[PDB]
Every structure is written in C-alpha cells, then in structure tokens.
Coordinates of C-alpha atoms and ligand atoms in Angstrom, one line a residue:
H1 CA 79.4 -3.6 -37.3
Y2 CA 78.0 -6.2 -39.8
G3 CA 78.9 -9.9 -39.8
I4 CA 79.9 -12.8 -37.5
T5 CA 83.5 -11.6 -37.4
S6 CA 85.4 -8.3 -37.3
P7 CA 86.0 -6.6 -40.7
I8 CA 89.4 -7.2 -42.3
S9 CA 90.1 -3.5 -43.1
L10 CA 88.2 -0.3 -42.3
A11 CA 90.2 1.6 -45.0
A12 CA 88.2 3.9 -47.2
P13 CA 89.0 4.5 -50.9
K14 CA 91.5 7.0 -52.4
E15 CA 90.6 9.2 -55.4
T16 CA 92.6 6.6 -57.2
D17 CA 90.0 4.0 -56.4
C18 CA 87.2 6.4 -57.2
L19 CA 88.2 6.9 -60.8
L20 CA 88.9 3.2 -61.0
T21 CA 85.4 2.5 -59.9
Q22 CA 84.1 4.9 -62.6
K23 CA 85.9 2.9 -65.3
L24 CA 84.2 -0.2 -64.0
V25 CA 80.8 1.4 -64.4
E26 CA 81.8 2.4 -68.0
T27 CA 83.0 -1.1 -68.8
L28 CA 79.7 -2.6 -67.7
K29 CA 77.2 -0.4 -69.7
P30 CA 77.8 -2.2 -73.1
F31 CA 76.8 -5.5 -71.5
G32 CA 73.1 -4.6 -70.7
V33 CA 74.0 -4.7 -67.0
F34 CA 72.3 -1.4 -66.3
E35 CA 68.6 -1.2 -67.2
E36 CA 67.3 2.0 -68.8
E37 CA 65.8 4.7 -66.6
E38 CA 62.7 4.9 -68.8
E39 CA 62.3 1.2 -68.3
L40 CA 62.8 1.2 -64.6
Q41 CA 60.0 3.8 -64.5
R42 CA 57.9 1.5 -66.6
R43 CA 58.4 -1.3 -64.1
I44 CA 57.7 0.9 -61.1
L45 CA 54.3 2.1 -62.5
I46 CA 53.5 -1.5 -63.4
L47 CA 54.0 -2.8 -59.9
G48 CA 51.7 0.0 -58.6
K49 CA 49.0 -1.2 -60.9
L50 CA 49.5 -4.7 -59.5
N51 CA 49.6 -3.6 -55.9
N52 CA 46.3 -2.0 -56.5
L53 CA 44.8 -5.1 -58.1
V54 CA 45.8 -7.1 -55.1
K55 CA 44.2 -4.4 -52.9
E56 CA 41.0 -4.4 -54.9
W57 CA 40.9 -8.3 -54.9
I58 CA 41.3 -8.6 -51.1
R59 CA 38.6 -6.0 -50.5
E60 CA 36.1 -8.0 -52.5
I61 CA 36.9 -11.1 -50.5
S62 CA 36.5 -9.0 -47.4
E63 CA 33.0 -8.2 -48.6
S64 CA 31.9 -11.7 -49.6
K65 CA 32.9 -12.8 -46.1
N66 CA 30.6 -10.0 -44.9
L67 CA 33.3 -8.9 -42.4
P68 CA 32.4 -5.6 -40.7
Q69 CA 32.7 -2.4 -42.8
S70 CA 35.5 -1.4 -40.4
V71 CA 37.7 -4.3 -41.3
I72 CA 36.8 -4.0 -45.0
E73 CA 37.9 -0.4 -44.8
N74 CA 41.3 -1.5 -43.2
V75 CA 42.2 -5.0 -44.4
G76 CA 44.9 -3.7 -46.7
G77 CA 46.9 -6.1 -48.8
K78 CA 50.3 -5.7 -50.5
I79 CA 52.7 -6.8 -53.2
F80 CA 56.3 -7.3 -52.0
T81 CA 59.2 -7.9 -54.4
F82 CA 62.4 -9.9 -53.9
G83 CA 65.4 -11.2 -55.8
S84 CA 67.5 -9.2 -58.2
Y85 CA 64.8 -6.7 -59.0
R86 CA 64.3 -5.8 -55.4
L87 CA 68.1 -5.9 -54.9
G88 CA 68.5 -3.2 -57.5
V89 CA 70.7 -5.3 -59.8
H90 CA 68.2 -6.6 -62.3
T91 CA 69.5 -6.4 -65.9
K92 CA 67.7 -5.7 -69.1
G93 CA 65.0 -8.3 -69.7
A94 CA 65.2 -9.8 -66.3
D95 CA 61.9 -11.1 -64.7
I96 CA 60.4 -9.8 -61.5
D97 CA 59.8 -11.9 -58.4
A98 CA 56.8 -10.9 -56.3
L99 CA 54.9 -12.1 -53.3
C100 CA 51.3 -11.2 -52.6
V101 CA 50.6 -10.9 -48.9
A102 CA 47.0 -11.1 -47.7
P103 CA 45.2 -11.2 -44.3
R104 CA 43.8 -14.5 -42.8
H105 CA 40.4 -14.5 -44.4
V106 CA 41.9 -15.0 -47.9
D107 CA 42.7 -18.6 -48.6
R108 CA 45.3 -19.9 -51.1
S109 CA 42.5 -21.4 -53.2
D110 CA 41.2 -17.8 -53.5
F111 CA 44.5 -16.7 -55.0
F112 CA 44.3 -19.4 -57.7
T113 CA 40.7 -18.7 -58.5
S114 CA 39.5 -15.2 -57.6
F115 CA 42.8 -13.4 -58.1
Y116 CA 43.8 -15.5 -61.1
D117 CA 40.6 -14.6 -63.0
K118 CA 41.0 -10.9 -62.1
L119 CA 44.4 -10.9 -63.8
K120 CA 42.9 -12.9 -66.7
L121 CA 40.7 -9.9 -67.7
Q122 CA 43.3 -7.2 -67.6
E123 CA 44.4 -5.8 -71.0
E124 CA 48.0 -5.8 -69.9
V125 CA 48.1 -9.5 -69.0
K126 CA 49.4 -12.2 -71.4
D127 CA 50.6 -15.8 -70.9
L128 CA 48.6 -16.1 -67.6
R129 CA 49.7 -19.6 -66.6
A130 CA 49.5 -21.0 -63.0
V131 CA 51.3 -23.7 -61.1
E132 CA 49.4 -24.3 -57.9
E133 CA 51.3 -27.5 -57.3
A134 CA 55.0 -26.4 -57.4
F135 CA 57.4 -26.5 -54.4
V136 CA 56.5 -22.8 -54.1
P137 CA 53.0 -22.3 -55.7
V138 CA 53.0 -19.5 -58.3
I139 CA 51.0 -17.7 -60.9
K140 CA 53.2 -16.5 -63.8
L141 CA 52.3 -13.8 -66.3
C142 CA 53.6 -11.2 -68.8
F143 CA 52.4 -7.8 -67.8
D144 CA 53.1 -5.3 -70.6
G145 CA 55.9 -7.5 -71.7
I146 CA 57.4 -8.0 -68.3
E147 CA 57.6 -11.5 -66.9
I148 CA 56.3 -11.6 -63.3
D149 CA 56.3 -14.7 -61.0
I150 CA 53.9 -14.2 -58.1
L151 CA 54.0 -16.2 -54.9
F152 CA 51.2 -16.0 -52.3
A153 CA 51.1 -16.1 -48.5
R154 CA 48.3 -15.9 -46.0
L155 CA 49.3 -14.3 -42.7
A156 CA 47.6 -14.8 -39.3
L157 CA 46.8 -11.2 -39.3
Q158 CA 43.3 -9.6 -39.6
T159 CA 44.8 -6.6 -41.5
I160 CA 48.0 -5.9 -43.5
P161 CA 49.7 -2.7 -42.2
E162 CA 51.7 -0.8 -44.8
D163 CA 54.8 -1.0 -42.7
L164 CA 54.5 -4.7 -42.2
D165 CA 58.0 -6.2 -41.9
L166 CA 58.3 -9.8 -43.1
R167 CA 61.5 -10.5 -41.1
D168 CA 59.6 -10.9 -37.8
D169 CA 59.9 -14.6 -37.0
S170 CA 56.5 -14.6 -35.4
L171 CA 54.8 -14.2 -38.7
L172 CA 55.6 -17.9 -39.4
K173 CA 53.9 -19.0 -36.2
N174 CA 51.9 -22.1 -37.1
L175 CA 51.3 -21.6 -40.9
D176 CA 51.1 -24.0 -43.8
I177 CA 54.6 -24.8 -45.1
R178 CA 53.5 -23.6 -48.5
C179 CA 53.1 -20.2 -46.9
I180 CA 56.4 -20.5 -45.1
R181 CA 58.2 -21.3 -48.3
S182 CA 56.5 -18.5 -50.1
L183 CA 57.8 -16.0 -47.5
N184 CA 61.4 -17.2 -47.5
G185 CA 62.4 -15.2 -50.6
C186 CA 61.4 -11.8 -49.4
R187 CA 62.9 -12.5 -45.9
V188 CA 66.2 -13.6 -47.4
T189 CA 66.4 -10.6 -49.6
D190 CA 65.3 -8.1 -47.0
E191 CA 67.9 -9.7 -44.7
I192 CA 70.7 -9.3 -47.1
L193 CA 69.8 -5.6 -47.7
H194 CA 70.0 -5.2 -43.9
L195 CA 73.3 -7.0 -43.4
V196 CA 75.6 -5.0 -45.7
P197 CA 77.2 -1.7 -44.6
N198 CA 76.6 0.2 -47.8
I199 CA 73.8 -0.9 -50.2
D200 CA 75.0 1.3 -53.1
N201 CA 78.4 -0.2 -53.0
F202 CA 76.9 -3.7 -52.6
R203 CA 74.7 -3.2 -55.8
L204 CA 77.5 -2.1 -58.1
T205 CA 79.7 -4.9 -57.0
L206 CA 77.0 -7.6 -57.3
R207 CA 76.4 -6.2 -60.7
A208 CA 80.0 -6.8 -61.7
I209 CA 80.2 -10.3 -60.2
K210 CA 77.1 -11.7 -61.8
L211 CA 78.2 -10.6 -65.2
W212 CA 81.6 -12.2 -64.6
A213 CA 80.1 -15.4 -63.4
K214 CA 77.8 -15.6 -66.4
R215 CA 80.6 -14.8 -68.8
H216 CA 82.8 -17.4 -67.2
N217 CA 80.2 -20.2 -67.5
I218 CA 79.6 -20.7 -63.8
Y219 CA 76.2 -19.2 -63.3
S220 CA 73.5 -21.8 -62.7
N221 CA 72.1 -23.3 -59.5
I222 CA 70.3 -26.0 -61.4
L223 CA 73.6 -27.3 -62.9
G224 CA 75.4 -27.3 -59.7
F225 CA 76.9 -23.8 -59.8
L226 CA 75.6 -20.6 -58.2
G227 CA 72.4 -18.7 -58.8
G228 CA 71.5 -15.1 -58.1
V229 CA 70.9 -15.5 -54.4
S230 CA 74.2 -17.3 -53.8
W231 CA 76.2 -14.7 -55.6
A232 CA 74.3 -11.9 -53.7
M233 CA 75.3 -13.5 -50.4
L234 CA 78.9 -14.0 -51.3
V235 CA 79.1 -10.4 -52.3
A236 CA 77.4 -9.4 -49.1
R237 CA 79.9 -11.2 -46.9
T238 CA 82.6 -9.4 -48.8
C239 CA 81.1 -6.1 -48.1
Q240 CA 80.7 -6.9 -44.4
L241 CA 84.5 -7.4 -44.4
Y242 CA 85.4 -4.1 -46.1
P243 CA 82.6 -1.7 -44.9
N244 CA 84.2 1.4 -46.3
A245 CA 85.5 0.2 -49.7
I246 CA 83.8 1.0 -53.1
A247 CA 83.1 -1.3 -56.1
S248 CA 86.6 -1.4 -57.8
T249 CA 88.1 -2.6 -54.5
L250 CA 85.2 -4.9 -53.4
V251 CA 85.3 -6.8 -56.8
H252 CA 89.0 -7.3 -56.2
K253 CA 88.5 -8.3 -52.5
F254 CA 85.8 -10.7 -53.6
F255 CA 88.3 -12.8 -55.5
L256 CA 91.0 -12.3 -52.9
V257 CA 88.7 -13.6 -50.2
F258 CA 87.0 -16.5 -52.0
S259 CA 89.8 -17.8 -54.1
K260 CA 91.4 -18.5 -50.7
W261 CA 88.3 -19.6 -48.7
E262 CA 88.6 -22.9 -46.9
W263 CA 85.7 -25.1 -48.0
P264 CA 83.6 -26.6 -46.7
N265 CA 83.6 -24.0 -44.0
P266 CA 80.1 -22.3 -44.5
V267 CA 79.6 -18.7 -45.6
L268 CA 77.3 -17.0 -43.0
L269 CA 76.0 -13.5 -43.1
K270 CA 74.8 -13.5 -39.4
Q271 CA 74.6 -15.7 -36.3
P272 CA 71.7 -18.2 -36.5
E273 CA 69.3 -17.8 -33.6
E274 CA 67.3 -20.8 -32.4
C275 CA 63.6 -20.8 -32.9
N276 CA 60.9 -22.9 -31.2
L277 CA 59.3 -23.9 -34.6
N278 CA 60.4 -27.2 -36.0
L279 CA 61.5 -26.3 -39.5
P280 CA 64.4 -27.8 -41.5
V281 CA 67.6 -25.9 -40.5
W282 CA 71.1 -26.5 -42.0
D283 CA 73.3 -27.6 -39.1
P284 CA 76.2 -30.1 -39.3
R285 CA 76.2 -30.3 -35.5
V286 CA 72.7 -31.9 -35.3
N287 CA 72.3 -33.2 -38.8
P288 CA 75.0 -35.7 -40.1
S289 CA 73.5 -35.3 -43.6
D290 CA 74.5 -31.7 -43.8
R291 CA 78.1 -32.7 -43.2
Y292 CA 78.6 -33.9 -46.8
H293 CA 78.0 -30.4 -48.2
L294 CA 80.9 -29.1 -50.2
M295 CA 80.5 -25.4 -50.7
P296 CA 77.9 -24.1 -48.2
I297 CA 76.5 -20.6 -48.5
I298 CA 73.7 -20.3 -45.8
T299 CA 70.5 -18.3 -46.0
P300 CA 70.2 -15.6 -43.2
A301 CA 66.6 -15.9 -42.3
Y302 CA 65.0 -18.6 -40.2
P303 CA 64.9 -21.4 -41.1
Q304 CA 68.4 -21.1 -42.6
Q305 CA 69.3 -23.4 -45.5
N306 CA 72.3 -24.1 -47.7
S307 CA 71.6 -22.3 -51.0
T308 CA 74.1 -24.5 -52.8
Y309 CA 73.7 -28.1 -52.0
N310 CA 73.7 -28.9 -55.8
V311 CA 77.4 -28.1 -55.9
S312 CA 79.5 -31.2 -56.6
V313 CA 83.2 -32.0 -56.6
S314 CA 83.5 -31.0 -60.3
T315 CA 81.7 -27.7 -60.0
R316 CA 83.5 -26.7 -56.8
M317 CA 86.8 -27.3 -58.5
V318 CA 85.8 -25.2 -61.5
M319 CA 84.7 -22.3 -59.5
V320 CA 87.7 -22.4 -57.1
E321 CA 90.0 -22.1 -60.1
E322 CA 87.9 -19.4 -61.7
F323 CA 88.3 -17.4 -58.4
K324 CA 92.0 -17.6 -58.7
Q325 CA 92.2 -16.4 -62.3
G326 CA 89.7 -13.7 -61.2
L327 CA 92.0 -12.5 -58.4
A328 CA 94.9 -12.4 -60.9
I329 CA 93.1 -10.2 -63.5
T330 CA 91.9 -7.7 -60.8
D331 CA 95.4 -7.6 -59.4
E332 CA 96.6 -6.3 -62.8
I333 CA 93.7 -3.9 -63.1
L334 CA 94.6 -2.5 -59.7
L335 CA 98.2 -2.0 -60.9
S336 CA 96.9 -0.4 -64.1
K337 CA 98.5 -3.2 -66.1
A338 CA 95.0 -4.2 -67.4
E339 CA 91.5 -3.0 -68.2
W340 CA 88.3 -3.9 -66.4
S341 CA 87.3 -5.3 -69.8
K342 CA 89.8 -8.2 -69.3
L343 CA 87.7 -9.4 -66.4
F344 CA 84.6 -9.9 -68.5
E345 CA 86.3 -11.6 -71.4
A346 CA 85.0 -15.2 -71.8
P347 CA 87.9 -17.7 -72.1
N348 CA 86.9 -20.0 -75.0
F349 CA 85.1 -22.9 -73.3
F350 CA 85.2 -25.0 -76.4
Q351 CA 89.0 -24.8 -76.3
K352 CA 89.9 -25.1 -72.6
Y353 CA 89.5 -28.9 -72.4
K354 CA 91.0 -31.7 -74.4
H355 CA 87.8 -33.6 -74.3
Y356 CA 84.0 -33.0 -74.4
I357 CA 80.6 -34.7 -74.2
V358 CA 77.9 -33.1 -76.4
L359 CA 74.3 -33.4 -75.5
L360 CA 71.7 -33.3 -78.3
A361 CA 68.0 -32.9 -77.4
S362 CA 65.2 -32.3 -79.8
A363 CA 61.4 -32.5 -80.3
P364 CA 59.0 -32.3 -83.2
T365 CA 57.6 -28.9 -82.3
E366 CA 59.2 -25.6 -81.0
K367 CA 56.6 -25.8 -78.2
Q368 CA 57.9 -29.3 -77.3
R369 CA 61.6 -28.6 -77.8
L370 CA 61.3 -26.0 -75.1
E371 CA 59.5 -28.4 -72.8
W372 CA 61.9 -31.2 -73.4
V373 CA 65.0 -29.1 -72.9
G374 CA 63.4 -28.3 -69.6
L375 CA 63.3 -31.9 -68.4
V376 CA 66.8 -32.7 -69.8
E377 CA 68.6 -29.9 -68.1
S378 CA 67.2 -31.0 -64.8
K379 CA 68.9 -34.3 -65.2
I380 CA 72.3 -33.3 -66.4
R381 CA 73.7 -33.4 -62.9
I382 CA 73.0 -37.2 -63.0
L383 CA 75.6 -37.7 -65.7
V384 CA 78.1 -35.5 -63.9
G385 CA 77.6 -37.6 -60.8
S386 CA 78.4 -40.6 -62.9
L387 CA 81.4 -39.1 -64.7
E388 CA 82.6 -38.3 -61.2
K389 CA 82.5 -41.8 -59.7
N390 CA 84.6 -42.9 -62.7
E391 CA 88.2 -43.5 -61.6
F392 CA 89.6 -41.9 -64.8
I393 CA 87.8 -38.5 -64.5
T394 CA 88.8 -35.5 -62.4
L395 CA 85.9 -33.2 -63.3
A396 CA 83.0 -32.6 -65.7
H397 CA 82.3 -29.0 -66.5
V398 CA 78.8 -28.6 -67.9
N399 CA 78.6 -25.2 -69.7
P400 CA 75.2 -23.9 -68.4
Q401 CA 74.8 -22.2 -71.8
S402 CA 73.0 -24.4 -74.3
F403 CA 72.0 -23.5 -77.8
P404 CA 70.6 -24.4 -81.3
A405 CA 72.5 -27.4 -82.8
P406 CA 73.5 -28.2 -86.4
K407 CA 71.0 -29.8 -88.9
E408 CA 70.6 -33.5 -89.0
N409 CA 68.2 -33.4 -92.0
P410 CA 68.7 -31.0 -95.0
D411 CA 64.9 -31.4 -95.9
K412 CA 62.6 -30.7 -92.9
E413 CA 63.5 -28.0 -90.4
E414 CA 64.6 -28.9 -86.9
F415 CA 64.0 -27.8 -83.3
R416 CA 67.2 -29.1 -81.8
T417 CA 69.4 -27.5 -79.0
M418 CA 72.6 -28.8 -77.5
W419 CA 75.1 -28.8 -74.6
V420 CA 78.8 -29.1 -74.5
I421 CA 80.5 -30.6 -71.4
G422 CA 84.1 -30.1 -70.3
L423 CA 86.2 -33.1 -69.4
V424 CA 89.5 -33.7 -67.5
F425 CA 91.2 -37.1 -67.2
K426 CA 93.6 -38.3 -64.5
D427 CA 85.0 -46.2 -72.9
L428 CA 82.6 -43.4 -71.8
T429 CA 80.0 -45.2 -73.9
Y430 CA 78.6 -47.1 -70.9
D431 CA 78.1 -44.1 -68.6
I432 CA 76.5 -42.1 -71.4
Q433 CA 74.0 -44.8 -72.2
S434 CA 73.0 -45.2 -68.5
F435 CA 72.3 -41.5 -68.5
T436 CA 70.4 -41.5 -71.9
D437 CA 68.4 -44.5 -70.8
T438 CA 67.7 -42.9 -67.4
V439 CA 66.5 -39.6 -69.0
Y440 CA 64.2 -41.3 -71.5
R441 CA 63.0 -43.4 -68.6
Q442 CA 62.3 -40.8 -65.8
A443 CA 60.7 -38.5 -68.4
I444 CA 58.4 -41.3 -69.6
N445 CA 57.5 -42.4 -66.1
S446 CA 56.5 -38.9 -65.0
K447 CA 54.2 -38.5 -68.0
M448 CA 56.4 -35.7 -69.4
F449 CA 57.5 -37.4 -72.7
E450 CA 56.2 -37.5 -76.2
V451 CA 57.2 -39.7 -79.1
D452 CA 60.1 -38.2 -81.1
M453 CA 61.6 -36.3 -78.2
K454 CA 65.2 -37.4 -78.7
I455 CA 68.2 -37.1 -76.5
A456 CA 71.7 -38.3 -77.6
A457 CA 75.1 -37.9 -76.0
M458 CA 78.6 -38.5 -77.5
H459 CA 82.2 -38.2 -76.6
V460 CA 84.5 -35.9 -78.8
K461 CA 88.0 -34.7 -78.8
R462 CA 88.8 -30.9 -78.7
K463 CA 89.8 -30.7 -82.4
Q464 CA 86.6 -32.4 -83.5
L465 CA 84.3 -30.1 -81.5
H466 CA 84.4 -27.0 -83.8
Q467 CA 82.8 -29.3 -86.4
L468 CA 79.5 -30.2 -84.7
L469 CA 78.9 -26.6 -83.6
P470 CA 77.9 -23.4 -85.4
Ligands
LIG1 N1 67.9 -20.8 -52.0 C1 67.1 -19.7 -51.9 N2 67.0 -19.1 -50.7 C2 66.2 -18.0 -50.7 N3 65.6 -17.3 -51.6 C3 65.8 -18.0 -52.8 C4 66.5 -19.2 -53.0 N4 66.4 -19.5 -54.4 C5 65.7 -18.6 -54.9 N5 65.3 -17.6 -54.0 C6 64.5 -16.4 -54.3 O1 63.7 -16.7 -55.5 C7 64.3 -16.0 -56.6 C8 64.4 -16.9 -57.8 O2 65.1 -16.3 -58.9 P1 66.6 -16.6 -59.2 O3 66.7 -16.4 -60.7 O4 66.9 -17.9 -58.6 O5 67.4 -15.5 -58.5 P2 67.5 -13.9 -58.8 O6 68.8 -13.4 -58.3 O7 66.2 -13.3 -58.2 O8 67.4 -13.7 -60.3 P3 68.5 -13.5 -61.4 O9 69.0 -14.8 -61.9 O10 69.4 -12.5 -60.8 O11 67.8 -12.8 -62.6 C9 65.7 -15.5 -56.1 C10 65.4 -15.2 -54.7 O12 64.7 -14.0 -54.4
LIG2 MG1 64.6 -13.8 -60.7

C-alpha cells in the first residue's frame, strides 16, 4: 500500500457517501474553487506555447555552441509544472509554478539573458520581471493575463528525453545548489502524486481543505501557518490511511486524524532513504536543532525538509483548536444535522478575541504601499515571537488577511493597508515599540525603505475594533 504505516480502514464508500460527496462539490462551486473548463484549456494551450519557446531557445544555444547537428537535432528541452496547478487544485486566478529543464550546455546566465530577452519580445508577455538573486532564482511574467513564475535548472545530461523523470536522485549528482533548490518543487509535487492511492479523491479533498483553511484564517506559511504544499501533504497522508474512501469521508477523516495528532511527531509520506550527497536533511536524531520544531510536516523527496518550521506556539495552538471545531462540524454533516456550507463559514475573527493589535502600514504611492506591505508582512512573526515570551500572553493570532485601512486625512487620498491580530491573556506599549523600531530599522538597513513609509501598531479592546475598521 501507501505510507509508512498500515491504513486505518480499507472500507469503501456507501451510496450514502456518494451523494454526500456530490453535495460537497456543489457547495464549493460558488467559492471559485473550480476553475472554468474554457480557462483550463486557455492555460493548457499557453503552456504549450511556452514549452515550445523553451525548445526553440535551447536549440539556438545548441547552435551557438556549434555542437554536432546530431545533438542539435536531439537536445530537447522541457517545461515542467509543479504546485497547485500541477496538482489539479488551482483555483480561479491562481498563478502557475514552472521549471525550465535544459541540458548541460545551457548555463544559468543564459536563462537570465538569452531566454529572458526571448520572452521580452513575445506579444503575450507583460510584466517581465526577473530575480536572479532569490533563494530560488526566477523569472516572473504575465502571459496572456496568467501569472507564471519560472525556475530554471541545468542537468548533467547532454539531451533532455521527453520521459525524463525528475525523481531519480542521481539527477542531483554534483550540481550547484541553486539547481538543486530549483528541482525540489517538481520532485515534491511529483512525489505527492505518487504517494496517494487515488489522485481524483485526493484532489477534491485538498480542494475542500484549502478553502476551509483560507476561510478560517490559517492559510499562510509566511505568517507561521500552512501553505499550499503543507496542506497538500497533510491531505495526502490522510488518503494513504483511507485508500478506498471518497471526498466527503476524507474531509471528515482529515479532521478526525489531525485534531488528535500528537505533535511534535512528524508527518511523513514515506520512509526517508539515505543518500551519499551532503545536503541539509531534517532529522532530530543527528541534528539537535531540528528537535525544537513544533509541527513538522516533512517533504518526501531527498533532501527532506520540514515545510513548516515557521510554526510557533501560538499558530500551533490556533490550528489545533481549528481542527477540533472542524471535526465537530463534519460530524454533524455526516449525521445530516448540518450542511457542508457550515464548514466554510468564517467565524468572525474580529469578534473571537477580547483583545487585538492593529498594524497600520502606508506609503506615499500605490507602487510603494505594495512594496512596503511586502517587507512588513515578513516581519510580523517577530512581534508574535515577542508577544509569546511575554508572561501575560497565551497566543497571538495574526489574521493572514490584511486590507485597506480607514482614512487618516480627509484631504489627500491614502495608500494604507492594515492587519488585525488576535490576543489571549493568562502595558503592550513596550513590545510594540521594539517591533516598530525593528521594522523601520531592518527595512532601512537593507536599503528597502523610503521616507514616508509608515508603520504603526496599537492595542485595542474588542468593542473598539469595529470602529477602526471598514
Ligand atoms: N517547503 C516546500 N517544499 C517543497 N516545495 C515547495 C515548498 N514551498 C513551496 N514549494 C513549491 O513552490 C510552490 C510555491 O507556491 P505556494 O503558493 O507556496 O504553493 P502552491 O500550493 O503551489 O500555491 P497555492 O497557494 O495553492 O496557490 C509550491 C510548491 O510547488
Ligand atoms: Mg503557487
């Protein structure tokens, strides 16, 4: 079977679960969860165009390197996809994650120069922006209105066979880490798709879970919660444990299983083999550092890593409790005492805590507000870390959903967004100032700050929140 343990139940559904699974599908449609068929066709044709451009590009490089006409006639080249799109659970408006795989005679500097220019002169391309210096180098663009983030990797192969499988550990044999990191995404995705008993049932379930997580304010890797990959792996492990169940049951078992999971025991999709290479691998047995991890969900391809080391005490608490409520609602639905709609109802965040901290960030230009909000959000965990060390606080729940904030000037217009943070006690002015000072500081030190880029935080009581809001 699938997994590092035996399944929990091999039971198949009853017609009763089949019609219950159809009502789920129906409850999801209004939420944009399912992309339109005409649009999926649009995206398919778009990738074909891209795949060809990559082919065309590589051939030209194969010619400038004068390689024999035999090689030139067989070098190949290919565009691989990964993440939600490749998983089959991308929603309306979601971006596409792609990797460009080329043979050895095409360097990375070629990707950022020869290939970048080729995209630059295509009629369908817009917003062609590159980031050659990121953790995972990437060229971003908007192809016919579709956001596409493209990684790049150079393999030690002379030619790229159409049936190349990127899971073969040998492919990493002595390669630049940049290349290794760029391959990780596809491998992890391709692994997940090969570790679940029934993909179709996996897709529909993942669909339901991601909506639920987003609606319940716990969807964000950056802010210490879970991102697409993490949710996909949790859902996959659930499938491995109920190989013959369908979506209505899996969604339920998802909550049954994880609301009772004993953290920090790690969530693994397969047994980790040992490989000669010396790459970072999550392993509490050899690495003491990895023992402090709170809610580990490990990547299935070498080198395995914890996809959620941003999860703190607060976030872990929040999600554990959210799993319990989740289990409860599905329990009713399964007893026909509730509708699937009840699972996707968002409990008013602005009313579920007796205290809150509100983050205000703004810049002089819409262009800047967007850039500023970027930097700010990456630092919000710092404040939570502080709020946590405080002896009077139990947890800080940052709502990963920011938004435009009220006017602070009736005259000139304003580009100001805001955040609302949940609090739970067992004054806060000092911790908030350290944060504020630290944000203004790190931003300025890393040359990513402009005069008039403001950031203010303030404590507020529930009753007073509704004021500083719509
Ligand atoms: N920790 C990770 N391990 C392996 N692959 C990762 C990891 N983080 C990101 N990726 C890959 O990069 C992709 C980044 O997009 P991200 O938004 O994080 O997830 P996604 O599920 O593809 O997208 P959605 O949020 O569902 O739209 C997702 C996955 O294919
Ligand atoms: Mg994505």
